[PDB]
Structures are given as C-alpha cells and as structure tokens.
Design a protein around this motif. Structure first.
Motif, PDB file in Angstrom:
ATOM      1  N   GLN A 168       0.786   0.555  -8.737  1.00  0.00           N
ATOM      2  CA  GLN A 168       0.419  -0.114  -8.498  1.00  0.00           C
ATOM      3  C   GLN A 168      -1.228  -0.589  -8.101  1.00  0.00           C
ATOM      4  O   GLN A 168      -2.356  -0.884  -8.631  1.00  0.00           O
ATOM      5  N   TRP A 169      -1.044  -0.168  -6.888  1.00  0.00           N
ATOM      6  CA  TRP A 169      -2.583   0.655  -6.655  1.00  0.00           C
ATOM      7  C   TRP A 169      -2.877   0.912  -8.300  1.00  0.00           C
ATOM      8  O   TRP A 169      -4.552   0.179  -7.756  1.00  0.00           O
ATOM      9  N   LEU A 170      -3.884   2.029  -8.287  1.00  0.00           N
ATOM     10  CA  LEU A 170      -3.788   2.280  -8.985  1.00  0.00           C
ATOM     11  C   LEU A 170      -4.444   1.591 -10.675  1.00  0.00           C
ATOM     12  O   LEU A 170      -5.632   1.157 -11.224  1.00  0.00           O
ATOM     13  N   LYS A 171      -3.405   0.423 -10.036  1.00  0.00           N
ATOM     14  CA  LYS A 171      -3.369   0.486 -12.419  1.00  0.00           C
ATOM     15  C   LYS A 171      -4.632  -1.331 -11.400  1.00  0.00           C
ATOM     16  O   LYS A 171      -4.805  -2.167 -12.597  1.00  0.00           O
TER      17      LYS A 171
ATOM     18  N   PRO B  32      -3.927   2.743  -0.868  1.00  0.00           N
ATOM     19  CA  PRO B  32      -2.775   3.215  -1.169  1.00  0.00           C
ATOM     20  C   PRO B  32      -1.579   2.567  -0.777  1.00  0.00           C
ATOM     21  O   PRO B  32      -2.012   1.702   0.823  1.00  0.00           O
ATOM     22  N   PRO B  33       0.041   2.565  -0.582  1.00  0.00           N
ATOM     23  CA  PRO B  33       0.744   2.101   0.366  1.00  0.00           C
ATOM     24  C   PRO B  33       0.609   2.918   1.520  1.00  0.00           C
ATOM     25  O   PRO B  33       1.583   3.868   2.042  1.00  0.00           O
ATOM     26  N   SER B  34      -0.508   2.447   2.112  1.00  0.00           N
ATOM     27  CA  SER B  34      -0.385   2.310   4.179  1.00  0.00           C
ATOM     28  C   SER B  34      -0.196   1.159   5.006  1.00  0.00           C
ATOM     29  O   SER B  34       1.571   0.700   4.894  1.00  0.00           O
TER      30      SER B  34
ATOM     31  N   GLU C  98       9.498   3.689  -6.781  1.00  0.00           N
ATOM     32  CA  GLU C  98       9.846   2.739  -5.642  1.00  0.00           C
ATOM     33  C   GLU C  98       8.819   3.061  -5.370  1.00  0.00           C
ATOM     34  O   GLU C  98       7.686   2.495  -5.243  1.00  0.00           O
ATOM     35  N   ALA C  99       8.470   4.532  -4.635  1.00  0.00           N
ATOM     36  CA  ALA C  99       7.923   5.059  -3.332  1.00  0.00           C
ATOM     37  C   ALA C  99       6.489   5.275  -3.754  1.00  0.00           C
ATOM     38  O   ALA C  99       5.414   5.732  -3.171  1.00  0.00           O
ATOM     39  N   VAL C 100       6.758   5.006  -5.785  1.00  0.00           N
ATOM     40  CA  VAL C 100       5.183   5.650  -5.975  1.00  0.00           C
ATOM     41  C   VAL C 100       4.641   4.253  -7.318  1.00  0.00           C
ATOM     42  O   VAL C 100       3.580   3.987  -7.470  1.00  0.00           O
TER      43      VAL C 100
END
Length: 25
Positions: A10-13, A23-25, A3-5
C-alpha cells in the motif's frame, strides 16, 4: 504473507520507496 506486507505494498503504491514515506512502522 499478503497482510503484513499489503500495508506496505500500500505504501509502495502510494509512492512508498519514492516519496519518502515510512513503511509499516
């Protein structure tokens, strides 16, 4: 912890570690 990844995967994709996206910032 897919989840927390998954948001980050999703970012990387989205071309995360490529198109200069944050990233999740």
């Amino acid at each position: 912890e897919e989840e927390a990844v998954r948001l980050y995967i999703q970012w990387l994709k989205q071309g995360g570690p490529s198109s200069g996206r944050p990233p999740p910032s």
